[PDB]
Amino acid sequence: QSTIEEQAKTFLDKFNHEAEDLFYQSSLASWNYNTNITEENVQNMNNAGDKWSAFLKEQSTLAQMYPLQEIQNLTVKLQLQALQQNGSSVLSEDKSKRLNTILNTMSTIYSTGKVCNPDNPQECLLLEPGLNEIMANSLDYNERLWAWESWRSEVGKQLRPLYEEYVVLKNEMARANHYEDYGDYWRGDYEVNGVDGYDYSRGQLIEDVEHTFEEIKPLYEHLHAYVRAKLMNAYPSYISPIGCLPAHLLGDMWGRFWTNLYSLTVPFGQKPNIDVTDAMVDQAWDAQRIFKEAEKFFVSVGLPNMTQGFWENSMLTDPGNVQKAVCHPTAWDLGKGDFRILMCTKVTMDDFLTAHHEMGHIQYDMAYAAQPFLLRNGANEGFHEAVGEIMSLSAATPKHLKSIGLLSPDFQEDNETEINFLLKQALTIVGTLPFTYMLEKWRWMVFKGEIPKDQWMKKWWEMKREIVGVVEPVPHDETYCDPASLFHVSNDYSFIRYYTRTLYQFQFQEALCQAAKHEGPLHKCDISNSTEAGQKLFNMLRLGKSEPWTLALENVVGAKNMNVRPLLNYFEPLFTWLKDQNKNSFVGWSTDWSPYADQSIKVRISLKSALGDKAYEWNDNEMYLFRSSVAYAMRQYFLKVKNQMILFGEED
Amino acid sequence: DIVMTQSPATLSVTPGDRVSLSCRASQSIRDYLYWYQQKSHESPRLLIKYASQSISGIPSRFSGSGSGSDFTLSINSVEPEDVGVYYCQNGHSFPYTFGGGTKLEIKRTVAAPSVFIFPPSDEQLKSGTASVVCLLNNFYPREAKVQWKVDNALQSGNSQESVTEQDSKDSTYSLSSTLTLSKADYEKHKVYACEVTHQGLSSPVTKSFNRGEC
Amino acid sequence: EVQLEESGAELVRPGASVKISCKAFGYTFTNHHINWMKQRPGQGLDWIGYVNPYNDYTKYSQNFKGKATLSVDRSSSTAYMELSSLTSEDSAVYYCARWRDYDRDWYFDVWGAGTTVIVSSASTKGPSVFPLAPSSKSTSGGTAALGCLVKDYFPEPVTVSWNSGALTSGVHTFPAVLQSSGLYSLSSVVTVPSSSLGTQTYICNVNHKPSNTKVDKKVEPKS
Ligand SMILES: *[C@@H]1O[C@H](CO)[C@@H](O[C@@H]2O[C@H](CO)[C@@H](O)[C@H](O)[C@H]2NC(C)=O)[C@H](O)[C@H]1NC(C)=O
Ligand SMILES: *[C@@H]1O[C@H](CO)[C@@H](O[C@@H]2O[C@H](CO)[C@@H](O)[C@H](O)[C@H]2NC(C)=O)[C@H](O)[C@H]1NC(C)=O
Ligand SMILES: *[C@@H]1O[C@H](CO)[C@@H](O[C@@H]2O[C@H](CO)[C@@H](O)[C@H](O)[C@H]2NC(C)=O)[C@H](O)[C@H]1NC(C)=O
Ligand SMILES: *[C@@H]1O[C@H](CO)[C@@H](O[C@@H]2O[C@H](CO)[C@@H](O)[C@H](O)[C@H]2NC(C)=O)[C@H](O)[C@H]1NC(C)=O
Ligand SMILES: *[C@@H]1O[C@H](CO)[C@@H](O[C@@H]2O[C@H](CO)[C@@H](O)[C@H](O)[C@H]2NC(C)=O)[C@H](O)[C@H]1NC(C)=O
Ligand SMILES: *[C@@H]1O[C@H](CO)[C@@H](O)[C@H](O)[C@H]1NC(C)=O
Ligand SMILES: [Zn+2]
């Protein structure tokens, strides 16, 4: 037994008693803030939140007296790793206050930075209203190129200096926690150590991501070539039919999701998509029936009822009056059998689907309620939002909709509607996987020093032409920080959790449709009325983090690593259809074409032949004098030939 | 589980002497033993925190050493009041099996016991039983032997001894052995003898009486 | 200050059950495990187990599972040890001791004083006294020894003095012995110059405090 083990076990027993009653108070005070926005309620959760944040730092230093080399129990050892990790407490005193100032500066530049119109400089647009609605709605080439560039440049410069400092620091925090760099710190969520054949290194994730990406690359090239052909009809004389796509024409500000190109790229535009938003009005479905239809969806597969206090304590419907609340759809795990759902539910199709999505998190949280407190989470960072998306995937099928009451029973779906559905999925699912892969591959190489600080923006657009297939419309030097203009980069968030969530989502779906004895294609599958499929899901749901995630995958899919063949079986009716539409077109892209390339003038300077000795060095100050000499030459030509006064600068 | 043994069993060292007491391990006990001083008719106290760290309130000269499987309690220039049974506890395994024990006596010179035999009182022989007491007074080496003989037959299994705590003045021991017989069996023999063997005696001393001789 | 309190030198009939209480003082309480140890007289210590006052969790050694139970009252700061099916073997000093911390340092700090648990029936009994006469067998040169044998009593605390407490030279009472009959016995002897065999007064004063026995017996040479 060894005293050590006993001591640890006890310490954890007295810990979980005093953690559960104290975390319940910090969560209920935050629930009362978000349903009831009062400035009384702001510091109601801030003194209760700091009672929690200080309680962890007391109990972290008490857990250092139990080293890990002698603990034989794995449940006890797993809670000690979550509690002994130092975090940002390992830094200096003035460096830990310097790091929190940089993080608060970058998140304030992102949310409060604005962009002003050039011809009317009194109207300035923030990002989240106004500048996002330009890139999502406009079809004008010059208005999309303006927003992009502008926002880019500004936020760029800002996040630049701060970003550099931050990168420099976060590495010291990771190396003092016995990691190689900060990229190795982020991959520690997937690390499994010594569970007798279920192990997983932190460097095996880079190999498993690059191996599974090379099988998406045939499907992505046919989707990239089909979008390029349909974009040439909306922007003629702007997109080369063998080159990359311009970065500002991709549906939003960064090109993360291609879902706003559906109105330009729809394969059969005359056939409308399956929408049940009007039959829910004609059957008078309020924001209690669709949660009762969602609850009976889960009891059909064998998952239990709701917890009988879920209906009383909830926020299923908006107040509407002066009583204010925040409407982001979240599931809550307050503690001691308290599970609450907060969303202002409309009567629409997607709020019927988001009700199935958010109740997937509640059925996940209701399963591992018997676990210890530190093991009440997903098996890694991808499992949580993957279970919540296979619930909305099955609930949006027309086989499920026609048996719930909507979608009148003499309704045969067309095989042109299924291609209209599969392309709207592939613009969001497949269209984000080369963006998610390239961004984490750029950040992993910056953190470990494989990319020097004078080649950050050279390697960013070299990787976008090669991996993503997206070209910049304006050349960006090392004064910009275009990756930091995304929310997850400047607010310190791990981005690999969106790649692995996409791969687990279809691995879970294919493993559940075989249990439910599904016959047709994968994208028409339902898991409802199948108890033997809910049994395969609940055996992973009840684990939490008590078992490794490689063992949690084998409880569902029968494998130990993440696989990409279930993703390609989902988009198999689309992939055969895309190979027929790209018979004449060119599949692939060349990384040499550029939107500014046919108007460029190449300058070649040979300094040591005109001077030899007494020849000056060509630094960045000489490039400033060249740009002012060309700007002088353009000013004289427009005055002496065209009689116009155009003030060209060196920034033009 | 783990068998904790003590390398000595009894010491009788004089004051002003630097000594060493060793508890050997069983398996691998990594610096998790604790030394306990227990005086007579009391509760034990602490002596060593983990292997050499000391508890505040102890006097000096109390130092432990060693790790892994060999430990040594070291006392330097001992006190006269540093007597008691010095234990060593265990760490690892839960069932903390307390060590054996190492008593601490003193004195340097051994003085042969005064011996004395006492026949049974006439009051007792009325009751129907005979106790025959033999006393050994003051004596260092307690490893004394008391052989009863009845008519020159060595008597086995009808005696009991007890011994006093080492005397706080002269550091000696005293021992009382009682031979118990029935009146009937007492009246069947003549010479009752008590033969004491001890290191301070060159040859054993016998004190004896003859039943029924004023 | 930090003390632990014990309770009762309990004499129990064998086969019954017992209740050993350990009361706390000073330190909080529900912040230090309470252990129990057994010490046979003239033998080394061994471990019983412990009861955590928080969570009422118990642990036992293998020689005591199903023998003794451990309970605790948070409202009165008392810990309980209760043995059951008491044989003649469970006759030892039982210590209650804590260690500090709660999970940090697992070494004992403060102890009780031990509750002497004796397992024997036949209720209490008074002592039977005989005088051990001074004799030439006991005489050697300048001195001769005489004493008093006080035997067959249960109620352990018994005292024998010499001449109402007068003689302190040579007076040595030996530890009482526990017979197979279940009753104690002892003998106290004193040496006195052999010129003074019968000359002065040598009367042993026997007092038995649990009972009320008080008897003075004179010791004289063999007639
Ligand atoms: C929203 O919060 C306010 C407080 O910030 C609540 O107002 C309290 O209402 C109770 C009665 O329900 C009074 O006894 C308190 O004195 C009020 N406090 C203050 C500061 O005015 C309000 O009731 C909350 N609303 C809901 C729906 O819970
Ligand atoms: C690791 O420690 C836990 C305790 O934290 C052990 O769980 C206990 O298991 C026993 C028997 O299965 C139960 O009676 C206890 O109630 C459990 N404790 C708790 C707090 O629920 C677990 O068994 C240990 N692991 C191994 C392999 O022994
Ligand atoms: C986390 O950081 C702390 C430093 O604050 C590490 O500290 C030990 O701290 C104790 C003080 O209680 C010292 O006695 C040790 O010598 C320190 N050890 C080292 C190696 O510095 C702690 O070990 C760190 N924990 C982890 C898991 O890295
Ligand atoms: C799950 O199975 C049940 C029972 O087989 C289905 O309930 C039947 O639905 C049909 C038409 O929807 C009705 O005519 C029957 O009266 C229902 N029977 C019962 C017992 O309720 C249910 O529709 C199935 N659900 C799904 C999603 O397929
Ligand atoms: C949907 O299914 C229909 C029926 O199978 C397909 O229509 C036939 O397609 C073949 C393939 O070239 C033609 O030879 C036939 O003449 C078509 N039939 C008719 C009546 O026109 C249709 O191609 C399928 N559509 C998709 C997108 O798969
Ligand atoms: C769930 O609750 C309903 C009542 O709302 C009840 O009829 C049903 O039996 C419950 N489910 C199970 C599995 O008992
Ligand atoms: Zn969400």
Tab-separated table of N, CA and C in Angstrom, chain A residues 25 40 56 98 124 161 172 197 262 274 311 344 377 382 389 408 412 419 430 478 483 502 577 585 627-628 649:
chain	number	residue	atom	x	y	z
A	25	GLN	N	-21.265	26.733	-5.854
A	25	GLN	CA	-21.553	28.132	-5.564
A	25	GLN	C	-20.970	29.062	-6.615
A	40	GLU	N	-25.521	44.303	-9.845
A	40	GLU	CA	-25.431	43.587	-8.581
A	40	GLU	C	-24.866	42.190	-8.795
A	56	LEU	N	-8.154	26.516	-5.761
A	56	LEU	CA	-7.349	25.609	-6.568
A	56	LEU	C	-5.865	25.830	-6.323
A	98	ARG	N	3.381	40.696	-16.767
A	98	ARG	CA	3.578	41.147	-18.137
A	98	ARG	C	2.784	40.293	-19.112
A	124	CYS	N	-16.999	54.382	-39.012
A	124	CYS	CA	-16.014	53.350	-38.729
A	124	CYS	C	-16.714	52.092	-38.244
A	161	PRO	N	3.553	43.122	-32.722
A	161	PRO	CA	4.496	43.288	-31.608
A	161	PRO	C	4.091	42.497	-30.364
A	172	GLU	N	8.653	30.281	-22.216
A	172	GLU	CA	9.292	30.158	-20.911
A	172	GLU	C	8.372	29.482	-19.908
A	197	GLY	N	-0.267	-0.615	-23.844
A	197	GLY	CA	-0.641	-0.747	-25.236
A	197	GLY	C	-1.626	0.279	-25.742
A	262	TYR	N	-22.643	29.106	-50.606
A	262	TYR	CA	-23.652	28.163	-51.061
A	262	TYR	C	-24.609	28.794	-52.055
A	274	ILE	N	-34.727	21.006	-47.713
A	274	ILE	CA	-35.776	20.534	-46.816
A	274	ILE	C	-35.851	21.455	-45.608
A	311	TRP	N	-36.531	20.881	-15.992
A	311	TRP	CA	-37.629	21.665	-16.538
A	311	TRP	C	-37.933	22.894	-15.695
A	344	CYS	N	-32.410	31.256	-25.859
A	344	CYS	CA	-33.661	31.895	-26.261
A	344	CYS	C	-34.140	31.266	-27.562
A	377	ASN	N	-15.233	15.416	-17.447
A	377	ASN	CA	-14.966	16.126	-18.689
A	377	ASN	C	-14.992	15.105	-19.817
A	382	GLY	N	-11.717	16.929	-27.997
A	382	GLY	CA	-12.532	16.759	-29.179
A	382	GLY	C	-13.796	15.956	-28.966
A	389	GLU	N	-22.651	16.799	-31.942
A	389	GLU	CA	-22.932	17.026	-33.350
A	389	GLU	C	-23.398	15.783	-34.086
A	408	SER	N	-44.915	15.601	-44.370
A	408	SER	CA	-46.063	14.755	-44.720
A	408	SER	C	-45.677	13.452	-45.416
A	412	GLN	N	-41.289	11.602	-51.316
A	412	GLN	CA	-40.087	10.940	-51.799
A	412	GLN	C	-39.032	12.007	-52.059
A	419	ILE	N	-27.732	15.851	-53.226
A	419	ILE	CA	-26.498	16.521	-53.613
A	419	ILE	C	-26.528	17.977	-53.167
A	430	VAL	N	-15.731	19.914	-44.872
A	430	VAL	CA	-14.487	19.685	-45.595
A	430	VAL	C	-13.766	20.998	-45.869
A	478	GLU	N	6.645	41.702	-43.381
A	478	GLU	CA	6.792	41.295	-41.991
A	478	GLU	C	6.334	42.348	-40.993
A	483	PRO	N	-2.179	35.958	-39.118
A	483	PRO	CA	-2.780	34.929	-38.263
A	483	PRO	C	-3.392	35.473	-36.989
A	502	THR	N	-13.827	16.895	-36.003
A	502	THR	CA	-14.434	16.545	-37.277
A	502	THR	C	-14.215	15.076	-37.606
A	577	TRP	N	-19.995	12.467	-57.755
A	577	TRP	CA	-20.645	13.508	-58.535
A	577	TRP	C	-19.683	14.622	-58.910
A	585	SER	N	-12.684	20.427	-66.408
A	585	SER	CA	-11.970	21.421	-65.629
A	585	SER	C	-10.652	20.855	-65.111
A	627	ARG	N	10.887	53.175	-53.027
A	627	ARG	CA	9.444	53.342	-53.075
A	627	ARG	C	9.041	54.804	-53.130
A	628	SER	N	9.863	55.702	-52.598
A	628	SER	CA	9.582	57.123	-52.719
A	628	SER	C	10.018	57.675	-54.065
A	649	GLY	N	1.931	58.078	-52.460
A	649	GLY	CA	2.883	57.968	-51.381
A	649	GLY	C	3.720	56.713	-51.534
